[PDB]
Design a protein around this ligand. Structure first.
Ligand SMILES: CCCCCCCCCCCCCC(=O)OC[C@@H](O)COP(=O)(O)OCC[N+](C)(C)C
Ligand SMILES: CCCCCCCCCCCCCC(=O)OC[C@@H](O)COP(=O)(O)OCC[N+](C)(C)C
Lengths: 716, 716
């Protein structure tokens, strides 16, 4: 895995990224895409059509004379928009995400320089890995002599590792507190200048207590007109368009899926009959005939739709025990969100409402007790997923440590591991397998967050990211560590005795570092570079437009871009931060790769937040408190592991120092928490009065009951 | 320590309590005390003077013909006032304290019956304590064969212990949740009917941010008139009047002191000259001469006392960055206490104010940063006190395990521990020594709570009780356990080998139980019975009245009773609950003694809450959340210790069951918490509006700015 495998992976990966960048140039210079690659410039009313208004080309005939402007330009230009002109083109959230990448860089760049110098020198001048291969059968290479494991048991050269660790934790923590403050100040300034949104005045009251002679709405009016007497303006109840909406949706699906097999070439048409109960399928069946999904799955749907409408809207059997109450001021609404209203701690429970567009309406109609049982069931499913994944994870770790599995088992083999280009290619293949598994993980975890019952689309994402973190941690990190350890040094474990289990464990942790390096390379580099091409979103449009088009004009738009994830992306940045801290005080060579990822990523994503991407909710940066927490967790795990390894190499004249480390970390956490979290979780009342008195001097007229009344209704 | 020592202690203690009760009868039938023994009947305007209006006797001449009405009566009668006529004679707090004693009884009575039956039988039919004295030198008696230690290693009779443990934890937890609800409902109903107090409308704002052109009061008016615009009525600033307060104090001391040395017999008088720098003293010195602290001292103090009044009432150098703001409604004030006011999380910080009489004004004039450093310094002092106490604690535990210290050291000895009445008397003496040390502890801990900076006299008490708990736990319990263990089985530890350290530890835990029994007896029984006599408060009055009297009439009153403590008392109840749980699943014989304490105590204290005692603040039961927590802690420690002992006797076919136990305990804690703590820590807004709308219909006129303006001023 020495320089050979690292170089092969690196060559292949840099090549993949350059090929990507070339195909992207090509595809972004053809004027039939355009609305796929420059969509927030069109969805902001600022770009018109193909060739500056369209009607023209720029396609393939000469297409492109050679260019070094095949890259670079996108690069520098993404770099040049001030960061305050980006808060208003894009939003605060996007800007705070790019900030995460830059904090990474900060921390790590300094740590890397230092590490390298001090520690590589120390570790390299020191002999104890050649002696264990010759007297204890521990397999190793020459990339392993810049690690904490070429160092003899018996210190005096372990103190470097401890001092460096201290330096590193202090730097990380300082940098992290400075970012907390910036992000807080920014949030507050944004919040003070954003224009009316309907949720700066509304709350969601959940658990209105039942009665037998008053409706839900005659009980919500009477409570707030007696208890919040001067500022109360209106309310809107919660009902079940769950079924009504399901039918409107089936109708849309039928019409799409059949105005297709309707204007196929015009005229009378064909047939199909897929088995329809799970997914995919086609022609395996009996539902022949034709057009409009027999225009009549078309019209039966429409009739059920009208009847459902009726029942719902006329029945107080479909009103849920909850409402959305609005007030005349933003000061009054912030007092109903942070105050207790009744003596029963579970009834009448106010919070702040989300913006009417970050509401997942399908879970506003789920009872409250169910909420608790559901949460439990989902925690159980999580534990089981964690176990099945351990299975696929070791499968991967057996392809990566194959040259040691083929020593205590000189059996099947890649022609007995000769033909050495093949084994480096095996390091690359291990990477690709883990990639695959982890894709479907993101989607499953979102489905499990939408069951436990949340009702904002921004909290479902935050939850999903937290769960990915846990999964990632355990599984990837530790599973890989454990299994890889097993295999190579399994060879060594058989032909020795059960004490050497520990020492062998220490050295194997540093080798798993080397595998992590390769994975970073694949994932990081190539993925950030292949994200620039938007390929599912490009096929998707072109198929769409030469199939289900029949556009009235061009007003029929199906370009919709997407949004950063929060989910996928944050989970990745965090895995890489963990890796980095841990390996900084052990193998100081994962750092250069971590850094290339952070920089490319910042450049690609600024481009995609500026040209493509559009945000679907605005919660001025709350995930910050969450991100900070996850970095503090990494720091603690790192520190505990260094203690462990230092114990395995018998150095007791240094581990209490490592203990002070952990305590200093938790103390800084607590400080930060205090100050800045207050900023992110509680709306001051002086801030709500200043926004409110400056808008009643500018718009001295304003009727708020027009605007706020119907903003929280549904598909009605 | 068998039946012999237990019986001697019990006889002597029951005798002491009966002698006490007799002397109390005597002293409560003489009509010169009366105002010492029936003071809340005089301080409520309901009793007049000595013999029904006084002027008469009932003293010593025939004094008392023999009576069996020498006791009993106080007993039944304390029992007969409904518990709702006691909420208004006395207050809610006192009633909730007596409830603690009754919960004790509940839990333990059931647990005791069960224990006894099942476990004593099981443990007694079983041989393994006679075999270890004959083959491992473990000293023991015959009271030890009803303990978990006459049971052979190897279970099948340890399962009883585990089942019983489960039963016991469930019962405790059920009982505890039912009390939570009662106490919560009671608090809420009280709070809804109590008449105006000035703090139902006021808050304390601490940390008003400095300026260079506006005073503290022109900055508190402007903030609340712009930010809480409609309900704001008044404010009163905080000034350091620590020095004037101190000189008024020195003046009263001088006059009292020496209007005494003045009317000694009238005329020209004597002299004195104590060393005056630390305390006590008399005649060792030079300050001779004459009457009322050389009346010139009394006037030089009244010079400073009028020129301190000027440099304090007109300066703005003695105004502290804080105020007390009042509002026109109780709904408005509860919104300022539970809401954030500014973006700087450390400035402008509102809470609810205490009643103007539960304010410790001396610490309202301490800066805020100091508050944090002070807290740290006091935590350090706590750790050191804990260590010195370990020293006196083992001294005590060496007098209690003397018959085993005099085996591996047949030396000095009580005439070689013969004369056996003497060694039982040593069990009683150990008890008395611990009593002594622990007295001065209560007072020290209060002094340390008044340094860390609190400003209510009710929180200083709560803090002091929590600290006593920790001290008690560690020191008493564990120190005693450890040291006692050491001594007896030290004998056994020398003449064996360092593996038998563990097994010997198990058996010694059960013997320390027996010593705890004796301490309970002394402390509990005799102390509750000697508390009925109020002897420092009786001497104190009689000296006072035949010395510093010269009463204008009788209006000069110096009877002041006191108040329950909260401090001392709660700390005791909790030590006994701990002991009980722990020993219930091990030595099932501490329980009968625990119970006698709980019952006597309830009877004596009801008497003293009904006749003597008067409350100095009213915080309708908040210490409840605190008490509950401490009982949950006991449950957890108990459970962990049973696991330990069961491990020491090699029973692995039962300890995971013990683990489930701990988790079930924390779950019930969390439920309770949720519901009822909300009740005790947050004032609902529907409750404040109902109190406010029913008082504006009864007293339709009411000016609140008269009443609320000057309630928060000082010695001015
Ligand atoms: C993630 C870690 C969390 C907390 C970290 C502390 C846990 C680890 C601390 C100790 C780890 C290893 C402890 C250690 O001491 O290992 C046991 C060694 O002493 C065993 O040495 P041996 O080679 O068996 O010595 C005997 C050799 N003959 C066999 C005596 C030659
Ligand atoms: C407060 C407790 C917190 C948690 C509770 C768990 C901690 C205690 C759990 C184990 C306690 C004792 C554990 C135990 O296993 O003791 C060690 C014994 O196995 C020693 O047995 P020995 O008599 O040394 O056996 C060897 C005998 N020769 C010497 C082999 C005869």
């Amino acid at each position: 895995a020495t320089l050979k495998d690292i170089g092969v992976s690196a060559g292949i990966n840099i090549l993949t990224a350059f090929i990507f960048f070339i195909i992207f140039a090509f595809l972004r210079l053809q004027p039939f895409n355009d609305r796929v690659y420059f969509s927030k410039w069109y969805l902001r009313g600022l770009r018109s059509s193909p060739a500056s208004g369209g009607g023209f080309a720029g396609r393939f005939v000469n297409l492109e004379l050679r260019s070094y402007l095949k890259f670079l330009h996108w690069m520098p230009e993404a770099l040049k928009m001030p960061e305050r002109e980006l808060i208003d083109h894009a939003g605060l959230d996007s800007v705070v995400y790019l900030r995460i990448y830059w904090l990474g860089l900060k921390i790590f760049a300094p740590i890397a320089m230092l590490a390298w110098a001090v520690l590589v020198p120390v570790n390299w001048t020191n002999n104890e890995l050649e002696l264990a291969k010759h007297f204890k059968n521990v397999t190793s290479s020459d990339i392993d002599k810049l690690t904490i494991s070429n160092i003899p048991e018996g210190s005096n050269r372990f103190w470097a590792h401890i001092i460096m660790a201290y330096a590193f934790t202090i730097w990380t923590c300082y940098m992290l507190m400075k970012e907390y403050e910036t992000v807080a100040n920014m949030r507050l300034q944004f919040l003070a200048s954003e224009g009316r949104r309907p949720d700066q005045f509304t709350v969601l009251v959940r658990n209105v207590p039942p009665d037998p002679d008053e409706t839900v709405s005659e009980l919500v009016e009477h409570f707030f007109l007696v208890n919040h007497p001067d500022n109360y303006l209106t309310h809107q109840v919660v009902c079940n368009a769950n079924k009504l909406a399901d039918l409107v949706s089936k109708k849309t699906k039928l019409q799409n899926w059949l105005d297709y097999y309707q204007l196929k070439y015009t005229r009378n048409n064909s047939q199909i009959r897929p088995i329809t109960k799970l997914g995919c399928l086609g022609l395996c069946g009996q539902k022949v005939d034709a057009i409009e999904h027999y225009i009549a799955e078309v019209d039966k749907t429409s009739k059920e739709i009208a009847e459902e409408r009726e029942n719902v809207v006329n029945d107080q059997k479909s009103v849920m025990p909850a409402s959305f109450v609005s007030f005349k001021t933003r000061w009054a609404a912030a007092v109903c969100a942070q105050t207790t209203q009744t003596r029963n701690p579970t009834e009448w429970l106010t919070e702040w409402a989300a913006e009417p567009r970050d509401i997942y309406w399908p879970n506003l109609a789920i009872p409250y007790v169910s909420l608790t049982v559901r949460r439990l069931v989902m925690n159980v499913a999580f534990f089981f997923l964690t176990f099945f994944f351990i299975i696929p994870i070791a499968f991967v770790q057996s392809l990566a440590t194959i040259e040691g599995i083929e020593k205590v088992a000189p059996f099947l083999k890649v022609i007995i591991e000769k033909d050495f280009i093949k084994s480096l290619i095996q390091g690359l293949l291990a990477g690709i397998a883990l990639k695959l598994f982890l894709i479907f993980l993101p989607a499953i975890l979102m489905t499990m967050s939408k069951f436990e019952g949340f009702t904002s689309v921004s909290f479902l994402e935050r939850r999903s990211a937290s769960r990915y973190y846990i999964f990632n941690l355990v599984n990837v990190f530790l599973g890989s560590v454990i299994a890889g350890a097993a295999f190579e040094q399994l060879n060594s474990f058989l032909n020795q005795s059960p004490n050497q289990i520990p020492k062998t464990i220490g050295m194997a942790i540093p080798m798993k570092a080397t595998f992590f390096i390769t994975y970073i390379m694949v994932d990081g580099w190539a993925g950030v570079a292949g994200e620039i091409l938007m390929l599912k979103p490009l096929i998707i449009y072109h198929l769409k437009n030469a199939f289900l088009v029949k556009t009235e004009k061009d007003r029929e738009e199906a370009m919709n871009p997407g949004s950063i994830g929060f989910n996928t992306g944050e989970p990745q940045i965090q895995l890489y931060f963990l890796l980095g801290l841990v390996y900084a005080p052990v193998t100081p060579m994962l750092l250069p790769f971590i850094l290339v990822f952070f920089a490319l990523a910042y450049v690609v994503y600024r481009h995609q937040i500026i040209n493509v991407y559009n945000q679907e909710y605005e919660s001025a940066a709350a995930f910050w408190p969450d991100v900070h927490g996850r970095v503090i967790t990494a720091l603690i795990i790192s520190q505990l592991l260094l203690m462990g390894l230092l114990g395995t190499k018998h150095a007791a004249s240094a581990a209490p120092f490592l203990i002070a480390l952990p305590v200093i970390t938790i103390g800084f956490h607590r400080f930060c928490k205090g100050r800045f979290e207050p900023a992110f979780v509680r709306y001051p009342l002086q801030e709500a009065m200043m926004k409110d008195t400056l808008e009643r001097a500018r718009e001295p007229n304003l009727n708020l009951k027009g605007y706020l009344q119907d903003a929280y209704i549904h598909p009605v």
